[PDB]
Design a protein around this ligand. Structure first.
Ligand SMILES: Nc1ncnc2[nH]cnc12
Ligand SMILES: Nc1ncnc2[nH]cnc12
Lengths: 248, 249
């Protein structure tokens, strides 16, 4: 009877999920609200995480302690990094990673600032397991959960559903050259602000995880933020969760 | 039962001195996060090894809130200097901490390249809700009485100055001196590290008094490389500080 945990950061990313729940009970602890109910008769907890890595990790940890979920779906909006993708396309996270983690080598003031020399700082994703250090350069989406979403692609009617790499950072990048550099360096499909942080906590608790993100925008094609994409993503995720539940 | 003081450090070298000071210990690990529960001066204290970076700090802090319901949080450890006035061994008491790594930029076309001086602090990363209502934060103030106590104890620290300052938290280790200088000039940072504002965010959400206490382990402004002994010195000061709080309980 362990629930599916479904996450979104902002109100617009969870209200459709919350409306789908039957026999809802609301719980707020600290800054974080949860709605506990059922989908297709099976326990589901919807979590509004608030925004960014710290909020995502807090909200995920709190859900682990309170609800002991059997799997986590983290979803919401993202900005395009891959020029092949457009607003409305959905990325299923084959992996996510902390794209905002940076270490740089020593340079004197005279040499100025060059972000192209910065390195991904992997210690930010390092964990312990039974007390022993375990390195991580990314967090893989549970590959069966990833495959299921890809297999359901034709059920989403507002864009393509594709596998891709989710770059998580406390960032909203609109310098197109920076987006291009991040894509060329890390092969990112899209950027957002929670996935790898929630994924880190799910790895620590050994709970299967998948990130599902709709492109709400992409500056690679002059496509500005469309809030309706967040609703469409939740509709797909409800369908996805119901399919999982049909198999439980 | 008395609510414990929670004391945090990210790495082994930042907690082993704290752990050795506790009496009647037990050690609890959940997920990736270890806690040592014991007493200092007969009062309950929990020492937390948070692991490194903002996500880990927030998870470790949240888990401690749920398991232990602490009465206050001291987040401590090492940091890299941003203020040229400061040297390795100096301790910064966090008048405020903030998410220095949070970046938002206005639209620029590819031909204009990349310009980090145009990346502005992205405050939504510190926004919270209080009883369901959105509350903006551009930083988290250290509890001002906790901050004041640490400053009042400055001359009990045997290995450097104790100064108030702004702690810049990011998933970063900056060694481009021009970048350090820019961050200092833009945000008035004393030092940079990787946990404080994230732990502070969680403490604010739970309305638990918080203070960040950081020793400079290094600063590229003075060619001072990392010295692990600073972490031990910081823990010694924090033990003295915690015992003073306990004397008042
Ligand atoms: N471009 C973008 N960057 C970061 N977070 C986002 N959420 C939606 N679009 C985003
Ligand atoms: N310069 C530095 N930057 C980030 N974290 C640190 N921890 C110790 N020194 C540091």
């Amino acid at each position: 009877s362990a629930p599916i945990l479904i996450q979104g950061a902002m109100d617009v990313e969870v209200e459709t999920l919350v409306a789908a729940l039957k026999d809802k009970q609301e719980l707020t602890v600290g800054s974080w609200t949860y709605w506990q109910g059922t989908l297709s008769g099976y326990p589901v907890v919807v979590s509004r995480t608030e925004v960014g890595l710290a909020n995502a990790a807090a909200a995920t940890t709190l859900a682990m302690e309170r609800f002991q979920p059997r799997l986590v779906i983290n979803q919401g909006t993202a900005g395009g990094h891959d020029p092949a993708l457009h607003r409305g396309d959905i990325v299923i996270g084959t992996k996510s990673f902390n794209m905002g983690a940076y270490r740089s080598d020593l340079t004197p003031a005279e040499q100025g600032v060059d972000p192209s020399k910065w390195h991904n700082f992997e210690v930010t994703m390092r964990l312990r397991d039974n007390g022993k250090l375990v390195e991580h350069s990314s967090f893989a989406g549970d590959p069966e959960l990833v495959g299921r979403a890809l297999g359901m692609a034709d059920r989403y009617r507002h864009g393509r559903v594709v596998p891709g790499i989710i770059g998580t950072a406390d960032e909203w990048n609109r310098q197109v050259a920076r987006i291009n550099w991040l894509h060329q360096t890390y092969q990112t499909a899209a950027e957002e602000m929670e996935t790898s942080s929630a994924a880190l906590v799910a790895e620590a608790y050994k709970v299967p995880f998948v990130g599902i993100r709709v492109l709400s925008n992409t500056d690679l094609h002059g496509e500005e933020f469309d809030p309706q994409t967040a609703i469409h993503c939740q509709q797909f995720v409800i369908d996805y969760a119901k399919a999982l539940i049909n198999g439980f």
